[PDB]
């Protein structure tokens, strides 16, 4: 019911709620996938509870009772999601040996730079996809000059940074 968007009605206005730790990752690597599924919905409902409580906290111009447990619940959802992705990845390396879940290719757009192109799903094959074939994955020769100019802008920023680091080091040896 909708009362699951709000916590225990005893806690209303108490300005401090004892919550435990977050889930770390290693505690969660011991749980089955069915158990991580169910824990995902536990943490999901808890997160919606705390977000309603934040928005009502800003509405009534008051501070949160305890804003820490929102950080803990986001912490736990992050750890849980990371664990599940680990198991997907390891199984993908065994069964197929790929490293990305989604295919792509190193291509090179109109602007000369090398880009990881992530593939999208389509229904028709690429040679008669009318919109895909309007994209240019090649740079013509009027770009190579700008590639050189960009290369030199990066080299100037790097040179300035490295030199500036050495000057600061000299000031530290003069001061100490």
């Amino acid at each position: 019911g909708l009362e699951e968007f709000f916590d225990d009605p005893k806690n209303w206005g108490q300005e401090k709620v004892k919550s435990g730790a977050a889930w770390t990752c290693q505690q969660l690597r011991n749980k089955s996938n069915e158990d991580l599924h169910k824990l995902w919905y536990v943490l999901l409902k808890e997160r919606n509870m705390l977000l309603t409580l934040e928005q009502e906290a800003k509405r009534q111009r008051l501070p949160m009772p305890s804003p820490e447990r929102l950080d803990k619940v986001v912490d736990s959802m992050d750890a849980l999601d990371k664990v599940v992705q680990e198991r997907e990845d390891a199984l993908r390396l065994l069964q197929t040996g790929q490293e990305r879940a989604r295919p792509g290719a190193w291509r090179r757009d109109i602007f000369g730079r090398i880009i990881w192109h992530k593939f999208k799903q389509w229904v028709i094959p690429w040679h008669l996809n009318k919109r895909y074939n309007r994209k240019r994955f090649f740079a013509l020769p009027y770009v190579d000059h700008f590639l050189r100019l960009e290369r030199e802008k990066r080299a100037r920023i790097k040179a300035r940074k490295e030199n500036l680091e050495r000057k600061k080091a000299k000031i530290l040896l003069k001061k100490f």
């Binding site: 435990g20 749980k31 158990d35």
Partner: protein, 192 residues
């Protein structure tokens, strides 16, 4: 927090800080000397001894360590006096506030000699690294319950290894466990 943000006695996000360090100020940065993470040897709660200024020779206890400015707040020493709670027409109260100290100005204290000793990080068989004084081979140790609420897992349920490592997906395992049965086979699309 911006570049060349100046650290102070207030924590880096408080109200007093945003009064002191608004997002548009630019000050001369403090040249602090580089102390490596492995080489910082004053911890919160160490009994120390002040070498310079007022309260020289007195042995206090480190309360806060502001490590970005090589700082030690010896609680109860190196004090000036500020008012607090000053309203429009009440003069507040007089309070002994504490000015910090650089790590150079403070030395540690042997718990059996009560003397200002140099500290080197020697190594030990039992513990990989710990502080050892110089005037004696003495290990000066690093210094310093709970009932669960209705939404904490007990230590029992938090540590049950319910995970049998298999070669199935979370998706496939939940489809089996939830009793969801999918007859339609997935139809191959193009990726480009």
């Amino acid at each position: 927090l911006p570049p060349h943000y100046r650290y102070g006695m207030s924590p880096p996000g408080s109200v007093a800080d945003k009064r002191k360090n608004p997002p548009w100020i630019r000050r001369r940065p403090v040249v602090v000397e580089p102390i490596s993470d492995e080489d910082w040897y004053l911890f919160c709660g160490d009994t120390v001894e002040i070498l310079e200024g007022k309260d020289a020779g007195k042995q206090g206890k480190v309360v806060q360590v502001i490590r970005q400015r090589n700082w030690v707040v010896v609680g109860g020493l190196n004090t000036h006096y500020r008012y607090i709670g000053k309203t429009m027409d009440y003069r507040g109260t007089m309070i002994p506030s504490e000015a910090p100290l650089l790590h150079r100005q403070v030395k540690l204290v042997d718990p059996m000699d009560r003397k200002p000793t140099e500290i080197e990080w020697r190594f030990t068989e039992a513990g990989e690294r710990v502080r050892v004084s110089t005037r004696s081979g003495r290990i000066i140790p690093k210094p310093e319950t709970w009932i669960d609420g209705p939404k904490d897992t007990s230590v029992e349920d938090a540590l049950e290894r319910t995970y049998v490592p298999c070669l199935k997906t979370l998706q496939e395992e939940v489809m089996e466990a939830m009793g969801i049965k999918e007859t339609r086979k997935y139809k191959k699309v193009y990726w480009y």
